[PDB]
């Protein structure tokens, strides 16, 4: 995390976009397996429910190995992306958005992420307050949905997505 503060904008396209895309398709592949299990209810579905739990657990490990680096990179470059629209930044919003949608829809995804944080003692708070400590500035300390990196990254990338839409599209957004 300390070394990401000097990262150049080229890392967004060269490294971050290909990496998150691999995570995005992996997330879609696992949830595709998860919905396959539920459509055919069976006593064997339990033998295989553990398989997708293992797939979700390893997936959550990969997300937490990249999102803390991504979150810090977004914070130091979100101002430039909003000042001048960037196609790559908009593409990254779709990737993190689809992962969030997968996380919100899938019940096991939330469970495995919560298990990963508590069992590995992931702070999930220093990842969001390191910049404040870098600048020389209880309730859910073990785990909280508000401090989840899957949803924290999206909220930091949300202004990028809203920047694409014109103000005339506000009515269409409400309808959708």
């Amino acid at each position: 995390q300390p070394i990401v503060s000097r990262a150049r904008p080229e890392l967004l396209h060269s490294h971050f976009i290909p990496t998150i895309g691999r995570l995005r398709k992996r997330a879609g592949k696992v949830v595709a397996e998860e919905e396959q299990l539920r459509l055919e209810a069976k006593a064997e579905a339990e033998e295989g429910e553990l398989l997708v739990r293992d797939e979700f657990s390893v997936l959550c490990r990969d997300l937490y190995a990249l999102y803390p680096l991504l979150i810090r990179y977004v914070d130091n470059n979100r101002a430039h992306w909003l000042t001048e629209p960037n196609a790559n930044a908009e593409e990254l919003f779709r990737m993190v958005g689809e992962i969030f949608i997968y996380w919100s829809k899938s019940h096991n995804f939330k469970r495995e992420e919560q298990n990963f944080v508590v069992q590995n003692e992931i702070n999930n708070m220093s990842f969001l307050t390191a910049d404040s400590k870098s600048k020389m500035a209880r309730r859910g300390d073990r785990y909280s949905v508000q401090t989840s990196l899957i949803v924290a990254t999206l909220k930091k990338m949300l202004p990028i997505g809203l920047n694409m839409c014109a103000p005339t599209d506000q009515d269409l957004i409400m309808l959708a």
Partner: protein, 194 residues
């Protein structure tokens, strides 16, 4: 003297907001004792901002937020830093940003104050100490704001004076002693007509 130390600037009471989301900027030309935030219309001119319940201000000299006392919040500012004061009367929260970056307390709290009652309403306010210079931008010209697009535009906040012809009238605390009637509810002084 005790009174010619802090000069408080606030908008006129006719601009009181009781709903919606509003945004304005305060530029710290100097780095000394200056406070900026939101205050209620009944703000008292001889009391430091945030020392009572009538103001929610951020002290950028040493990184503190003031409301009925002081508690650490954010980081101290530098010369030329712009503080973006944001109030959300739909969520009853107040957010302070420094150069487009949201200030945070010693926790994950992204908002300086929470569960604030609307009541009479709120007004933009700032106070300057001895030898302090600050620039207040209420956003009459949206292009003049330096960090509204970076943080505040996409969140649904509007400049405090987005659609206004004349500049917002401001009132300041004048340190000229004047004779006023003794209040009937003065805590220490009582006058009886015999």
């Amino acid at each position: 003297s005790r009174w010619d130390r802090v000069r408080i600037f606030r908008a006129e009471k006719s601009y009181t907001v009781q709903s919606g989301r509003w945004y304005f900027e305060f530029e710290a030309v100097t780095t000394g004792e200056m406070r900026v935030g939101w205050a209620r219309p009944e703000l008292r001119p001889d009391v430091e901002l945030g020392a009572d319940e009538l103001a929610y201000v951020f002290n950028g000299h040493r990184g503190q937020r003031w409301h009925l006392g002081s508690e650490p919040f954010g980081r101290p500012w530098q010369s030329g830093d712009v503080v973006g004061c944001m109030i959300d009367l739909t969520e009853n929260t107040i957010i302070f940003t420094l150069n487009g970056e949201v200030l945070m307390s010693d926790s994950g709290s992204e908002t300086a104050f929470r569960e604030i009652e609307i009541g009479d309403g709120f007004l933009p306010v700032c106070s300057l100490g001895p030898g302090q210079v600050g620039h207040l931008n209420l956003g009459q010209d949206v292009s003049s704001l330096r960090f509204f697009a970076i943080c505040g535009l996409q969140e649904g906040f509007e400049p405090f004076a987005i659609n206004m012809q004349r500049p917002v009238t401001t009132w300041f605390s004048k340190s000229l002693p004047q004779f006023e009637p003794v209040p009937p509810e003065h805590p220490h002084y009582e006058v009886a007509r015999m």
